[PDB]
Amino acid sequence: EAVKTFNSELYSLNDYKPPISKAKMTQITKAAIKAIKFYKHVVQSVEKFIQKCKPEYKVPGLYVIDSIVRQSRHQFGQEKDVFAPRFSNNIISTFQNLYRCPGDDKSKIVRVLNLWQKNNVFKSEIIQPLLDMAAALEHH
């Protein structure tokens, strides 16, 4: 029911042409952060969305991950945030899906990865492979 609400905010992205408003992302985030007891289901729903959504929503879906993890780290502390560690489990697969996006949108993905590294959102054993993955795509 906390999860139902989050699911409802997340999937209502399909009502909107990106760019998505700050307000909508904040709504999705608050639903996630308020559903923190069920963080595993929240991560699962975000990953499912990223797997299934149309190409135009890949960056929105990544911004959901960004927004949730950065809010959580700020609200609960970097040490204590459950979101980034749980997102880390499947994150390589998650990015494989994110990169089925319009070519014009890859620069946005790399920008978030860069910010994540600078802000130590994920430890470098996570971030660098993801960064490696972006580099490898323009080559092919």
Partner: peptide
């Protein structure tokens, strides 16, 4: 949304 936007707090 911007990935540099400030997080919310009291």
């Amino acid at each position: 949304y911007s990935p540099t936007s400030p997080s919310y707090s009291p």
